[PDB]
């Protein structure tokens, strides 16, 4: 049982081509969703900062975005992560606020029945 990496330049170009069709389908929105900033859970890397999965419910409510719409404007949700330190709430709320600063939202046509 042996594996060869001859398709390594083939697979990389397939991935790039897979990104370009995604960009074609969804033009204005970025090819990647926003991710939060979290700290690795170990004494070795705890002083580091990296990306998370999504923004917890305290990070959404504090920033001012409901949890239902957040999934629609590209902000992802992590029901499992929680905020134990306020610096973790702060680094990710401002991460949301800077995102909503640059976020153009296209209006959608809405059904308007004659009566009500």
């Amino acid at each position: 049982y042996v594996k060869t990496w001859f398709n390594q330049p083939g697979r990389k170009l397939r991935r790039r081509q897979a990104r370009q069709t995604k960009a074609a389908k969804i033009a204005p929105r970025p090819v990647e969703a926003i991710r939060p900033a979290v700290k690795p859970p170990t004494i070795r890397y705890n002083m580091k900062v990296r990306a998370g999965r999504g923004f917890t419910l305290e990070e959404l409510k504090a920033a001012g975005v409901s949890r239902r719409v957040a999934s629609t404007i590209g902000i992802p949700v992590d029901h499992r992560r929680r905020n134990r330190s306020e610096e973790s709430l702060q680094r990710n709320v401002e991460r949301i606020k800077v995102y909503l600063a640059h976020l153009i939202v296209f209006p959608r046509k809405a059904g308007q029945p004659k009566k009500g």
Binding site: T42, I43, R44
Partner: protein, 49 residues
């Protein structure tokens, strides 16, 4: 009579934890010297440039 066998298990963790921070510090300390230890401009090399 010493700690525990799994308490010496953490002895690597108090040995390996200060690896990443040491390595990151070595990266910036090397770069800091690089800014310091650079050759001056040689003002005679703009005669033609």
């Amino acid at each position: 009579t010493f700690v525990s066998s799994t308490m010496v298990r953490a002895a690597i963790r108090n040995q390996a934890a200060q690896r990443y921070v040491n390595r990151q510090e070595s990266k910036l300390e090397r770069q800091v010297r690089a800014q310091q230890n650079v050759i001056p401009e040689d003002p005679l090399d703009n005669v033609f440039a």
